[model samples]
Target: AQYEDGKQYTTLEKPVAGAPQVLEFFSFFCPHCYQFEEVLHISDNVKKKLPEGVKMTKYHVNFMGGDLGKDLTQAWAVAMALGVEDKVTVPLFEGVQKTQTIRSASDIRDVFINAGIKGEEYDAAWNSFVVKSLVAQQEKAAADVQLRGVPAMFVNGKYQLNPQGMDTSNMDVFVQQYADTVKYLSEK
Candidate 1:
């Protein structure tokens, strides 16, 4: 699935690489994504049991079909490209979760700089090629996938529905599947 403007992609074009990985598609503004983070953090304890190099990553969806969406999407990309993903992701999640504030690039920049990602460097990366590409990719993904909500999960390029209920047992199954599925795909 090649990326196309305004198109949302359910499957990744490239095959999942390395050990095992779980990619989360979410928006910082969503309360559900915030709650999901708690689950993700606990997942660390179980990481040891999974294949080596298992990792969790987030794909911020700020480009579903709106103007402001681009700014938020761009801010996330910039943070990731600048090696300030953790600095920005955490605070961004916290702010949105607690205050429900969907901020702009400047807001994110302010938050990230406060978190110790150099202000100058943050601005530069916000306009960098790497970040720009990420935003574009996200825009394409939104249009192609027709994503209507937040907190979608994908394992090795396959989207899985999280079963209902708060047990989270079912969620772990798919989370584990990502690592296993990636390994399985790599061998073929």
Candidate 2:
């Protein structure tokens, strides 16, 4: 259950401003992310087990969907603003992958509406000042990390978890190791 530099994780050049940060990067079109949520439950477990104030921010990468990715990124920002991130995550996955219902902004908007966020409330949050900034920050953070793929976890915006380095044959052990890494890094 031990991790080494350049193996379990790698250090970042300019760490993000916020210390003790846990950021997870994924794309709306990523099947691995879908599996991560539904099967492996890595994000689900990591998010729940992290200590208080050590929340994981699920960030959407702009490279996958290109322009649409940017819009979905905004959708992600608005979801967080409406305090419905968890409500929207899997729905977005199902909408985009399983159901094949998410193709544009309107479909993404419908996911939020179905999640019980009012249309006006969703609009307000979408256009709000902070959400806009958050969208940019999420994009910048993804680029900052030089992320090559989805389902990536970072500790304090510096150390990135290397799934290849972990023994994933037994997920119970893997999940424990993953959670422990974030908990251990939160104080570093």
Candidate 3:
């Protein structure tokens, strides 16, 4: 979705401080989101293009409320809280999408273990109030946005770059859409 006086996307009622917010909403159970990871390698290539002063955040959608959804949401939240997102994000995706090694909360901890995070340390962050709070906030944010699917992007908290409306026959086009959207909105 392109920003045009906030008509194309959901405009934020109240703007966030510091910089424009760019949020990507996803779910580990979502196959499309998995493909999005493969298409963009998300944490690396895509994020590098973010303009200065833009606040980029990722939220895991919990619309399903199943065990897998719950587990993955908490796993990602804890990983972020513990400052291991760069180390574990892609591997976490691989574990679920390719290796099929992450299912339960324990399985997620094992991924952290392989990434050099101690098992007990993983448990601490996984159970910490910080992780729990962030998870709660994400749930509320997902509901507030009326999100229906994964691989969705929200820019400046006002514009939602809907992947469903994007042409995904080519990865380059997909990434270009996002890049153009960010550049267009950031200039505003």
Candidate 4:
């Protein structure tokens, strides 16, 4: 799916539940966000420990978009618009990590083209309603949530937090603690 330039966003059917929700806004190009990907992706135990029906929506941050971060946020917006959000995770991260060089919109496009997307299709998806909404939401999320960095998280929208200045060791512990924190809040 391709998108137009200057447009942004992609809203999900699943609203951030007012009851209790965990939202993680992450950047694929950021090493810190990447470090926690394992915990975010593999922690079934944390999910199980949840009070039930807790939805987690992870949005790709694009503030690093345009020239920096390679506009992978645009690619992410494209994938979400085309209903292929799940298709973008691993390859995008691996490719970005492998290059280890500066990222640009062209570099991100290379990744999509490699995955068999045409430039036009990619562009259209990049500018679609879904994509636009997502990008806009990320910006709004940062300001409204008062976030300081990627891999930033929010619990129930009112409690925004991150582990940037923490010990930095045992991220798994943080992941678990996040689940526990959600549980505590849900019960409140």
Candidate 5:
């Protein structure tokens, strides 16, 4: 696995998670965020296999606009709370970032709807303090890491991934390289 500052990865000021995790700071409003995981199929490829207990967690950055980021992050928080992330993650990104189908939170419900989650469940999760607390954590984590970009990923919330450091010429190996490095860093 690659290990070099500004090359493979850069160290965060401090760890953000209590347990091992690959924290991805992204915004549904950002196009590049869509390209990274959704377009390139990065998460699809990497999510298949990795260290046990090491989850590829995502936090929506709230400064991207509209509700000053809180609203989108709140939606993500709700999905997380209801355990619908795998169901609605790509839909959220595509609808918000590319398709423009999700014009607002009301429309965002459709994404959840297609995931088999109803309005009642969505509302319950959205209105709870648990979801609010989760959104709060996202804001704090982004600020604590001094994040200035969407799609910022970290290993154990300590080392940020740098794609420039990896071999991107071939998509197959590139994804494998990412998975390998992430798994490698998780053990560290």
Candidate 6:
């Protein structure tokens, strides 16, 4: 698919270096993001086709605002900083979107604790300066990208894929299109 410049994706004015970065801008409160979670970790067969040195990161979008937004975004930062994102990421989505249980920091902490995070570990990470800085970085990164919605994808900080603009009639084609885009960008 010949992606249009302004509609399908936008090229960043200044791009970052290192391995090709695949960033997913998401929000726990977004139902669409929750639905897209499974698409993130495709089968190993599909992943094997990806180019070498492709680093994927998820940035929490603070679109909700207020305490819910701040707390959920902070929870994501703490999970990432403590290296427990894999453990708690999906649970958070489920807790918020499916169960509709998360409302505050305490609820987020409970979800983490249930996900096997030690209470002390969760507390320490949640309040740590490093986690705070990471949250700030995520916010700044979203701002830099001019993120307007959840479940958005960006390649190497330069190419952003518009989720709404994608042709979702076929999941295989959808996945292949993005995989090809990432591979091509990584090679450049």
Q: Which window of ten consecutive residues has the lowest lDDT sum in model 6?
A: 38-47
Ranking according to TM-score, highest score first: 2, 5, 6, 3, 4, 1
On lDDT, the leading prediction is 2
Candidate lDDT (C-alpha), each: 0.58, 0.80, 0.72, 0.59, 0.78, 0.74
TM-score of each: 0.66, 0.87, 0.82, 0.68, 0.86, 0.85
Best by TM-score: 2
Show pairs that collide, candidate 3. 10-158, 11-158, 12-158
RMSD of each: 7.4, 2.2, 3.2, 10.3, 2.4, 2.8
* Worst window of 10 by summed lDDT in candidate 3: 1-10
Q: Which pairs, if any, clash in model 1?
A: 6-143, 7-140, 7-143, 7-144, 8-141, 8-143, 8-144, 8-145, 9-145
Query: After superposing candidate 5, which stretches have Cα over 4 Å from the reference?
Result: 13-20
What tens digits encode model 3's per-residue C-alpha lDDT throughout 1-188?
Answer: 23554443445666544322777788776777777676666534446777776667788876654888788888889877888877887787788778888767778788889999988888888889999998987887776666787777766656666455557788877677767666666556
lDDT score, candidate 5, position 118: 89
Better of 2 and 6 by lDDT: 2
lDDT per residue, candidate 1, 1-188, as tens digits?
22221232234554344412455567776666666665554234334444655576566786442555566688878876776776677788766567645455566667877898887888778778888888876666554445677776445444433323124456676445433433443232
lDDT against true structure, model 4? 0.59
Error of 2 at 104 (Å): 1.1
Report the lDDT tens digits of candidate 5 across residue range 55-147: 677788877866735677898999889887888888888888677888777888778988899889998898999998998888888887888
lDDT leaderboard ranking: 2, 5, 6, 3, 4, 1
Of models 1 and 5, which has the larger TM-score?
A: 5
Instruction: Give the Å error, residue 39, model 6.
Output: 5.5
